[PDB]
Ligand SMILES: CCCCCCCCCCCC[N+](C)(C)[O-]
């Protein structure tokens with residue numbers, strides 16, 4: 095067996111396994127504890143596995159949130175930093191609320207950070223919002239965009255339907271059958 | 278066997294192997310632990326391997342992000358350094374969101390840093406955006422530029438469709454068959 | 461065998477090897493560990509090897525980046541220094557993005573450093589950009605300049621097509637066959 | 644055998660060998676480690692070798708770069724010093740970029756240091772540029788001046804084609820045959 | 827109103843920030859020299875002054891720039907708050 | 913403003929070097945007279961002051977000509993800068 099990757103996290107490993115199985119590559123996950131997980135494949139599949147790891151840029155980088163840049167361990171933080179932490183917490187709370195709606199599997203939300211020129215004496219600017227979401231198969235997406243827009247509009251003090259962008263997509267085909275073992 | 282490279286990391290090694298396999302050069306990856314990975318090839322292929330290493334300038338440099346220039350552990354932070362870390366984190370969070378859209382494999386995003394003036398005295402100037410992305414084979418690229426533009430427009434306080442550039446490309450042919458071993 | 465060079469690094473060694481092989485000179489690489497790499501050639505080829513080493517000025521110098529002159533790990537940083545590190549990071553991030561376009565092998569980018577005046581009490585000059593790129597054989601260079609210009613224009617707050625210079629070139633012929641051994 | 648020089652560096656010794664070989668003088672390079680390299684010739688060639696060492700002023704002095712005058716690590720810097728380090732880095736970066744153009748072997752760049760006056764309360768003068776380059780044999784120099792002018796023009800905020808000087812030269816004949824040994 | 831309260835608060839905040847570093851180094855030098863004079867028994871009293879003068883002047887050289895950028899930005903801000911009403 | 917930068921930095925450098933010499937002399941004398949009291953194990957308040965005064969007066973008798981040269985040079989230079997534009 096040939097080593098593809100070592101020292102992976104659990105949530106990196108399960109993503110790599112998922113992407114290899116989709117292309118009919120049988121892979122194995124091994125746990126070394128403090129050394130993390132290792133991924134191995136057979137030689138006939140080695141070439142393909144390498145090319146897919148390249149194409150998808152695996153393993154995935156960790157997920158980024160703006161509050162990571164303003165750790166709140168400061169001695170004191172400016173208005174600019176406080177207003178950033180605030181907005182970054184509202185974004186996460188909204189994504190978690192949308193995941194509870196009917197038939198939504200996952201979503202992402204973005205808010206226009208007015209903080210760029212907070213506290214230069216000038217007045218603030220109206221807010222804008224963007225959302226992505228994934229639906230179960232057979233959902234009337236067109237009829238479901240209205241609900242999302244309606245829900246988002248009243249979460250903020252001044253928002254116009256014109257300023258809300260919504261993009262929806264359906265889930266891909268289910269991967270239920272196991273890949274074939276090399277002869 | 279002749280040594281091409283030593284002391285690589287895991288990402289550098291997999292990128293090298295991928296590019297060599299594409300040109301029909303069979304290569305071997307060896308792990309020395311604390312010394313990293315080593316790459317070796319047969320003599321008949323040594324010349325070619327050297328030429329391709331030179332042409333692609335492997336092994337790749339690590340990826341660059343603007344926040345690396347303004348460590349938060351500094352004794353002092355100015356407004357310029359704070360706004361630099363803010364924009365450097367929004368760019369990354371947009372790239373991570375685009376990777377979730379239907380049929381995208383990877384993407385890159387750029388924002389106009391107006392922070393190179395203090396936003397003082399002179400009023401601030403409108404934002405510009407650029408995006409690059411890669412698509413699965415058989416995608417109507419022309420019809421897909423619209424979605425990206427729509428999604429990006431509302432992510433900031435003031436952006437015009439005229440100020441958004443989008444460049445798309447398709448994935449190359451898959452490298453599935455293994456290279457032949459030298460006689 | 462005659463010693464040409466000692467204590468080279470890995471990248472220097474592989475550069476020298478590539479240049480010599482192109483001219484039909486068989487060379488050998490030896491590893492001394494903490495003492496680096498050594499390059500040796502046969503006597504019949506010594507004269508030519510010396511002449512080419514002079515002509516190309518090998519071994520290559522380390523690559524220069526502007527931020528090296530204004531290290532961030534320093535007690536205090538003048539505005540000029542911070543304003544310099546910002547640009548010297550944007551340059552590198554654009555190079556790294558261009559390398560991802562279809563068919564490009566490598567690129568270099570340059571930006572006009574307006575920091576060479578503070579422009580305090582003064583209107584800021586417009587930005588100018590220059591770019592160099594190398595393409596795979598059989599690429600329609602003429603039709604590819606447009607994409608690059610379009611992409612670069614929106615990277616900065618105010619850029620005119622007239623202020624963007626682009627120079628393209630094709631890859632040279634591949635060196636695949638091995639050089640002949642002296643009789 | 645007579646001693647010409649001792650305690651040389653690697654890159655001094657190689658230049659000396661190259662110049663003696665070009666005039667039909669067979670020379671030998673010896674390594675003493677901590678004592679550096681030594682160069683020896685036969686008595687019949689001693690006179691000629693001394694004449695050429697005088698005429699070319701060998702061994703060469705190291706390259707001079709302006710940043711060596713203004714170290715980054717002094718306690719304090721006036722604006723003039725910082726501004727000089729900045730241009731002293733842009734020169735080196737442009738040289739390294741031009742060396743990647745098609746068929747260029749080596750190049751030199753010079754920039755007008757306006758820094759030697761403040762231009763405070765005053766209009767800062769426009770920039771001037773000079774470049775030297777060496778080409779492989781069979782290059783249409785006349786047609787290649789345009790490319791370099793076009794490329795350098797946009798590297799700075801305000802440059803006129805009139806203010807750019809470019810001087811080109813072809814490579815000399817190749818030294819491939821070895822010199823004859825005294826009878 | 828809140829603009830008044832904000833600007834007045836910020837004034838004290840800037841005093842604190844700018845003055846803080848010199849007073850820190852003058853403290854640390856005072857403690858170290860005072861200890862040294864107990865570790866080896868010497869009853870001098872100008873030595874602290876001689877050292878701390880060099881200590882304070884050095885960091886005034888270092889921070890000379892940030893001092894002017896902060897005060898300019900503050901002055902522009904308060905002039906805007908005062909005059910730009912509509 | 914390279915002129916304001918220069919005149920402002922030089923003023924502080926001149927303060928530091930003009931004042932340093934008397935204080936250095938006073939400190940070295942202070943230490944030696946403090947030591948001698950320890951090796952003699954004999955103690956009084958006044959001996960160090962008495963010697964310090966003489967040490968500083970000699971320092972001034974010697975250097976003072978150079979203090980005048982330095983101050984005149986700076987005095988002219990700043991005036992020429994102030995009225996340089998015309
Ligand atoms: C006894 C010295 C008291 C100095 C109080 C004022 C501190 C700021 C001095 C101006 C800024 C620093 N520098 C070096 C240009 O002078």
Ligand SMILES: CCCCCCCCCCCC[N+](C)(C)[O-]
Nearest residue numbers: 580844893894895897898913916
């Ligand atoms: C006592 C506060 C600290 C000293 C600095 C006072 C401000 C002086 C004027 C700053 C001018 C800045 N400059 C040269 C960029 O214009």
Ligand SMILES: CCCCCCCCCCCC[N+](C)(C)[O-]
Nearest residue numbers: 890891894916917920923924927
């Ligand atoms: C000797 C103590 C008083 C010296 C006062 C010098 C004032 C310099 C004002 C300008 C400071 C800011 N700077 C250097 C950027 O111009």
Ligand SMILES: CCCCCCCCCCCC[N+](C)(C)[O-]
Nearest residue numbers: 968971972973974975976977979
């Ligand atoms: C205790 C006296 C303090 C005087 C401070 C000024 C000293 C320098 C200027 C006076 C010099 C007099 N001198 C040496 C020319 O006679």
Ligand SMILES: CCCCCCCCCCCC[N+](C)(C)[O-]
Nearest residue numbers: 972973975976977978979980981
């Ligand atoms: C008793 C202390 C008197 C201090 C002031 C003495 C007068 C100023 C010095 C005048 C002479 C200056 N000098 C030495 C350059 O000629």
